[PDB]
């Protein structure tokens, strides 16, 4: 119940033969997994972190210019040459300057003039890559136990370290069996297209090709104290004002320009371990060995009293918190739901089956009431605690919200949203294959399109669809216009 | 000669004394005494709890 209150949770409920259900973790939301006889637990991918990062390429952000040396030839003969030109550390440029008797040359006319300065770089920008060998995912799993201090408690949990070498690490929950994780960590944010821009103690996960296409001069990338820099011509600005001579000026410090050139990148915390916090992971949940505590306990026949007022969460759960008043401590809590004094039992306990483990140890229950009046009976007898509640909503509204949530998931996850909570099945396989093919084609088409250009192109294409009448309307409009507007209204995550 | 200035615009800033306040749902916006100071730049946001 470290999952309550996040506002991003989403409940997986299915189960199959061998009781395996694959769910997807996104660093933002915490999954909840309910089952018929398995204790409902919750999962959250805490932090993805890498280690032993190599440096692929180094970029200069600002420079200093010293030792400006110049040389000119007599006009109409030869071309100005300078021994310092061949040096890798020196930036040079050739220009033509008028010369005459005033300048000492014999014959009037334009003559070449080369100026060579010393480009000693400063404030490098390292660009680091990570191999899949060292990437590590940490996963936290908690079963709904009804402990006193376990409402959205970020700390207490069970951690399982997942690495590509050994990706089938199974958690060992106390008194609940062993939840088995068999996940593929190769999929996810493809780290073969990630270069970390460690630039003055701020990292970023940019695309590889975009990093290679940064105009700033690039170094060899090896570990040296005086690396040679290629493409130095664009961070020093030679200025030939009029035609008498030319000066040499260093451009400046490119940090502010870099920060606005990274306006779409995702930030990652870089201090010590480069613990990335954005990303997603697909994992299978093998719940065969997993059991629930105290299925055989007797029922409670005593008084129950609320110790904290019931307050509905964002998704409809109400978080009942009660304390036992009887003398039989190792006992099971009863439950009942009536809509309009009718035992329709149209409710559900997101907790598996809450049980009191001590006489006066408070226990908290997460129940899902129906959409109307819902009288909830906890104890038995005339002393049964009665929690009146009223969930304000409609069933169709919940379906619309679920559809919107699924659409957002399909927009963020490429096609793994088709596997999120996909309990086996053959229909989901065909859906995933179709979506994979069409999404690959669609992203190959709309590679690197603006937040507003997507909306504009979508409007234009849906208008084209509404115009054409050769049954191109039906596919053009539906397949491109609506999809592209929906995407372009979401892309800026 | 004899140029008169009329605007100074900044390039290099420095952020000091970051302070935060938060409040429960349906209890109003968070308020902080440092808002009524020229040097302070302060932005609201929404958090879940």
């Amino acid at each position: 119940m470290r999952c309550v209150g996040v506002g991003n949770r989403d409940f997986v409920e299915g189960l199959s033969g061998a009781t395996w259900v694959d769910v997807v973790l996104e660093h933002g939301g915490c999954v909840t997994t309910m089952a018929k006889n398995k204790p409902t637990l919750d999962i959250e991918l805490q932090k993805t972190e890498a280690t032993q990062l190599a440096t692929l390429r180094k970029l200069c952000i600002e420079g200093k210019i010293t030792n400006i040396t110049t040389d000119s030839r007599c006009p109409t003969q030869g071309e100005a040459v300078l021994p310092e030109e061949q040096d890798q550390n020196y930036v040079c440029k050739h220009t033509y300057v008028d010369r005459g008797w005033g300048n000492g040359c014999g014959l009037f006319g334009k003559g070449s003039l080369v100026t060579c300065a010393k480009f000693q770089c400063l404030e490098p920008i390292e660009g680091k890559v990570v191999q899949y060998e060292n990437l590590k995912y940490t996963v936290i799993i908690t079963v709904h136990t009804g402990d006193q201090h376990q409402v959205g408690n970020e700390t207490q949990g069970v951690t399982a370290e997942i690495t590509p070498q050994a990706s089938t690490t199974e958690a060992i929950l106390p008194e609940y069996g062993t939840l088995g994780l068999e996940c593929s960590p190769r999929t996810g944010l493809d780290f073969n297209e990630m270069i970390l821009l460690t630039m003055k103690n701020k990292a970023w996960m940019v695309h590889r090709q975009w990093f290679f296409d940064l105009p700033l001069p690039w170094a060899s990338g090896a570990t040296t104290e005086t690396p040679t820099w290629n493409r130095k011509e664009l961070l020093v600005t030679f200025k030939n004002a009029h035609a008498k001579k030319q000066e040499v000026v260093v451009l400046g410090s490119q940090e502010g320009a870099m920060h606005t050139a990274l306006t779409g990148a995702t930030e990652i915390q870089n201090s010590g371990g480069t613990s990335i916090f954005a990303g997603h992971l697909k994992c299978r949940l093998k719940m065969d060995k997993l059991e629930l505590k105290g299925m055989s306990y007797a029922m409670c026949t005593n008084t129950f009293v609320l110790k904290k007022e019931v307050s509905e969460t964002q998704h409809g759960t109400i978080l009942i918190k009660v304390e036992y008043k009887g003398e039989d401590a190792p006992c099971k809590i009863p439950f009942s739901t009536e809509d309009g004094q009718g035992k329709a039992h149209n409710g559900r306990l997101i907790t598996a089956n809450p049980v009191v483990t001590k006489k006066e140890e408070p226990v908290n229950i997460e129940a899902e009431p129906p959409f109307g009046e819902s009288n909830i009976v906890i104890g038995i007898g005339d002393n049964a605690l009665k929690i009146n509640w009223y969930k304000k909503g409609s069933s169709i509204g919940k379906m619309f919200e679920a559809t919107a949530r699924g659409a957002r998931r399909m927009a963020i996850l490429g096609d793994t949203a088709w596997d999120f909570g996909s309990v086996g099945g053959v229909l989901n396989s065909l859906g995933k294959m179709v979506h994979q093919i069409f999404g690959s084609a669609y992203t190959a088409l709309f590679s690197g399109v603006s937040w507003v250009m997507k909306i504009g192109i979508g409007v234009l294409l849906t208008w084209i669809g509404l115009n054409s009448k050769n049954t191109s309307m039906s596919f053009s409009c539906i397949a491109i216009g609506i999809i592209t507007l929906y995407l372009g209204a979401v892309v800026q995550a | 000669t004899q140029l008169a200035t009329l605007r100074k615009l900044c390039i290099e800033g420095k952020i000091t004394n970051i302070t935060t306040d938060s409040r429960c749902p349906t209890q109003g916006e968070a308020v902080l005494p440092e808002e009524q100071d020229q040097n302070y730049v302060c932005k609201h946001t929404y958090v879940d709890r």
Partner: antibody
Amino acid sequence: QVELVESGGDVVQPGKSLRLSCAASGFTFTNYAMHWLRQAPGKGLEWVAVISSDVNDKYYADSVKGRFTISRDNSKNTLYLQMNSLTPEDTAVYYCAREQAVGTNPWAFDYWGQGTLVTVSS
Amino acid sequence: HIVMTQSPLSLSVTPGQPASISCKSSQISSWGSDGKTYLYWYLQKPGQSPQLLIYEVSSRFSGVSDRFSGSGSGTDFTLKISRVQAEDVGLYYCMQGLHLPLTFGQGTRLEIK
């Protein structure tokens, strides 16, 4: 690229006051808090006094509190330190430290001056 | 008046070897409002003026070699050097910037073994 050069350091007998001056260059001075730090020979670095961006606000180390005075001539782009009632203990190499270029602390050191030596002895 | 105690007082290490310097505080230097930890590490090279290596607990300063990295959360901070060169001779004075009367440590010394 910034250059902080010391000035005013010389010999002085105990009890005779001295005024130190820190000349600054390479940056806009009026926006930077400045510090005075000293290192007695064979002793750890010991911060002396700080003046913030606004001229009025100043602070001094308790070991030297009430004996020194720190002033800012930002129009000339230089810092002033006034040493009064000097003690033979108060002999050290004195430094002039700028405010941090990037960070969160209102007062920090990023660039240290070349250093001047003041000797208080008889 | 937080007093800074450093664990090592002399560190003689051969070149191409790691090194660990410890600067232990008398109080947690973690500013509550921002959650940062203001501990600085300077190096005064012999016959030179002090530099600034790591302007936080672990975020190194500009112009500093690749090997200098720090750590520590509340009171036990470290300065890790990966491969010692011949230029690392100096005095690694740590410092706390949490409180106004900021005080340096005694400062360790590094020499080539």
